[PDB]
Write a protein that binds this ligand. Structure first.
Ligand SMILES: [Zn+2]
Length: 218
């Protein structure tokens, strides 16, 4: 497998030592009000040498329409079979429209906009920006605001065979340069996808489809 950029999906290029770094900027909601971040739940496991990788409807409260959700529920796997559990458990992913400010490993990406996926560690980092400590001179930040945001420094290094994001961190506040220019603003926005698209009926609402599939995989 390889290159994702061409399809509008950016991924941090890691080097030989599994390390990597960049400066990206999380963009606000394309559309009115809110939701600059998409939250999608799935299940992704291999068993018997087969793979089950599908979206989950728990993503909008509907746990019943998901075979794997029912399985974990009926069998209390969390408790009765914790090994099956961690394998089978639902996975949460977050997506954003981002502006690559600096990408040393691939400079042609800078200034371009892509959709970016991530997990709890970077999500937490985004949330702790609003939950600050006043006694340390901290003030809350909407890192997605084009005028009050803060670029993010994405830094990776392998620990225990796992990418560790501990060096990642938000910089001071600032405005996206040129943001107030209509040509620029509109070219940036032309590059932003509708994140709600990812959370519409992309779920095989045919739990039955999902079930025969879960079936031959199990
Ligand atoms: Zn599920």
């Amino acid at each position: 497998g390889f290159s994702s950029e061409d399809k509008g999906e950016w991924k941090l290029k890691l080097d030989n030592a599994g390390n990597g770094q960049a400066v990206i900027r999380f963009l606000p909601s394309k559309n009115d009000e809110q939701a600059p971040f998409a939250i999608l739940v799935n299940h992704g496991f291999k068993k018997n040498g087969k793979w089950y990788i599908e979206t989950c409807s728990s993503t909008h409260g509907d746990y019943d329409s998901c075979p794997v959700c029912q399985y974990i529920s009926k069998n209390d796997l969390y408790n009765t079979d914790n090994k099956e559990y961690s394998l089978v458990k639902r996975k949460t992913s977050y997506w954003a429209n981002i502006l690559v400010v600096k990408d040393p490993a691939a400079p042609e990406n800078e200034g371009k906009v892509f959709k970016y996926r991530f997990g709890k560690k970077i999500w937490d980092k985004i949330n702790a920006m609003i939950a600050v400590d006043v006694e340390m001179g901290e003030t809350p930040v909407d890192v997605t605001c084009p005028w009050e945001g803060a670029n993010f420094v994405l830094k990776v290094k392998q620990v225990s065979g796992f990418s560790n994001y501990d060096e990642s961190k938000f910089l001071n506040q600032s405005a996206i340069p040129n943001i107030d220019d209509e040509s620029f603003q509109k070219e940036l926005f032309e590059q932003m996808v509708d994140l709600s698209e990812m959370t519409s009926k992309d779920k095989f609402k045919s739990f039955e489809e999902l079930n025969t599939k879960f079936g031959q995989v199990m």
